[PDB]
Design a protein around this ligand. Structure first.
Ligand SMILES: OC[C@H]1O[C@H](O)[C@H](O)[C@@H]1O
Ligand SMILES: [Mg+2]
Ligand SMILES: [Mg+2]
Lengths: 287, 287
């Protein structure tokens, strides 16, 4: 069973249904508020666990009631929490407002995620380290260095986009694999050994040591495409070969990640849409 | 020592600092996030208490972990809770967003507050009833009727706008004092005996039985306007003459409310920014 370590963010997603966003100086009432655990790090960790990896999540919870819910969510998905921390203050928070014209406005605050401390002995004995950019770069960097020493694959989801160019250079230099959609790729300072670019419905493409190729997605009709990125990243990490690897294994992993990303669109919601490993097999046979 | 009774809402506030207010569709990363007790009802009770009134609050808490923090906040500011209830499910949630120019947007999922029904003891032995519109309008109406029977002042903060029209109409019919910003004054069914239209950092406008006039506010560099209105409202309630009153006593109340409101903008934070009676005095002496 492949061992994955995720060092990344966990957010409480608060989704408000409103008629319109509030104007300056205005108070507006929501029709509903729905609370759902999320954040890139936790989404990816769940995706990886559902896909069949043994996952350890290393992240930071606040001391708010939200933190208890985020813990319950990860534990129920068989994600390990030996190596997380509790820091005073709020958990990472994402506010998602859906209005009457079905536009989504998002507001994210790092909360606890900004206080995350590297745990090098945790990335020891794991095959794949998966990290993203909702935590501070320095922490992702620290974790990436530990994985390098432990001969673990360093896999970075270059997300969110719009990170500052030179702050990312040291991390770019050290990544084996970088996952990114097209927009995100443009903000990544230098190509890794294995650059994997996601293409919404189409699937993904690869450019690196194994050459250059498209990896198509089983075709499906979407219900909700949110959360499909995080599923892709988690299923990639759960499937990428340990070092030194081989093109056929990396390819197998890419196809599996595409299939899963495609399946995640079939379900509504962000944090709960990761398919099980059997569903990924099924979807792959069905082509 | 004036007896003010607030029937209204209590919420946990999530306050985000941004550069610019998110636009429909946008994804914004926030600079900071705080989690503090609030709600128009609560803020107004606290402000009235710090202003020297003897204050009872009547609202609905959820049976959730947030409730204890909210209750504790009111007790720490000397507000009474004997007429409050508990509605199973969540306490209210609010998202406040504050930007560079100290402007703010407020979005509320009222939770328990939307299920506040009329509490029998709610208004006994009070000089002034202060209410607002996050709770059901029917409940604010009931509180108003009971206040008139006991010859208490019916004071309504007509916020948020757009609530149940027929209940609004019945309430507008009997209200003594209505506090509202320009947008909210507009949505209100018919004018009260004393119509107090707030004007942000400029202070307030009066329309009613005392005539028509402006009341300037001390000139200040706003740090954060979130919560300043609730301060105005509570301070008003704490100083409004027992019916019947002199124009001089009403005027003194408006003056103090403007001074207080402007003080409240100097402080970051929503539910904690109300000044003590002595700071209102010190601000008024300095003109
Ligand atoms: O006026 C600001 C208040 O409005 C909402 O009720 C929030 O809870 C916040 O405390
Ligand atoms: Mg989905
Ligand atoms: Mg303030």
């Amino acid at each position: 069973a492949p061992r994955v370590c995720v060092v990344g963010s966990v957010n409480m997603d608060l989704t408000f249904v409103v008629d319109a966003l509030p104007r300056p100086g205005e108070t507006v009432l929501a029709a509903s508020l729905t609370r759902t655990p999320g954040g890139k790090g936790a989404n990816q960790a769940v995706a990886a666990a559902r896909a069949g990896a043994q996952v350890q999540f290393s992240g930071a919870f606040g001391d708010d009631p939200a933190a208890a819910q985020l813990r319950a969510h990860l534990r129920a998905n068989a994600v390990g929490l030996d190596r997380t921390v509790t820091v005073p203050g709020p958990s990472g928070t994402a506010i998602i407002v859906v209005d009457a014209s079905a536009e989504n406005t998002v507001l994210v605050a790092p909360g606890a995620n900004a206080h995350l401390t590297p745990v090098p002995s945790a990335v020891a004995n794991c095959d794949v380290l998966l990290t993203q950019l909702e935590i501070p770069v320095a922490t992702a960097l620290a974790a990436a260095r530990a994985a390098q020493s432990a001969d673990a694959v360093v896999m970075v989801n270059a997300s969110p986009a719009g990170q500052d160019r030179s702050s990312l250079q040291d991390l770019a230099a050290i990544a084996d694999v970088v996952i990114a959609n097209e927009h995100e790729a443009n903000d990544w300072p230098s190509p890794p050994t294995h650059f994997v670019i996601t293409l919404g419905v189409r699937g993904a493409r690869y450019v690196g040591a194994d050459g250059v190729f498209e990896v198509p997605a089983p075709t499906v009709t979407p219900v909700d495409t949110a959360g499909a990125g995080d599923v892709f990243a988690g299923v990639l990490a759960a499937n990428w070969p340990r070092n030194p690897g081989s093109p056929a294994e990396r390819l197998r992993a890419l196809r599996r990640a595409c299939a899963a990303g495609a399946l995640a669109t079939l379900v509504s919601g962000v944090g709960d849409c990761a398919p099980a490993a059997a569903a990924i097999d099924a979807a792959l046979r069905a082509n």
